[PDB]
Amino acid sequence: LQQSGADLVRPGASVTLSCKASGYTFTDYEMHWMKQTPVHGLEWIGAIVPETGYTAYNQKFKGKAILTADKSSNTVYMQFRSLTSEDSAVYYCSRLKLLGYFDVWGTGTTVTV
């Protein structure tokens, strides 16, 4: 449970936001990403399996959202591309078990565009 901070982002700028994992091993747990919109509530974005190295996304957010992870330092990076003013939301790191629930949760890194 370690994150980045809030940003001030122009429309059309590519920003990489990380929350690095500490304590728990990368071979066991799998991250996801979130959006907290005041209209659509919560939305799902994507995931990382860092062993295999590639997973899928939500189909709205493919292309814009790219998820990379450094398994040595255990640093999990998003990357957004060509942001809009609609992405004022709260983004939550999350942790899963296989056939399992959400163990830990991040505080949030707001992107105020």
Binding site: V49, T52, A56, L96, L99, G100
Partner: peptide, 9 residues
């Protein structure tokens, strides 16, 4: 939740 790794298996 099931998990995205269950997609690959």
């Amino acid at each position: 939740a099931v998990g995205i790794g269950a997609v690959f298996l």
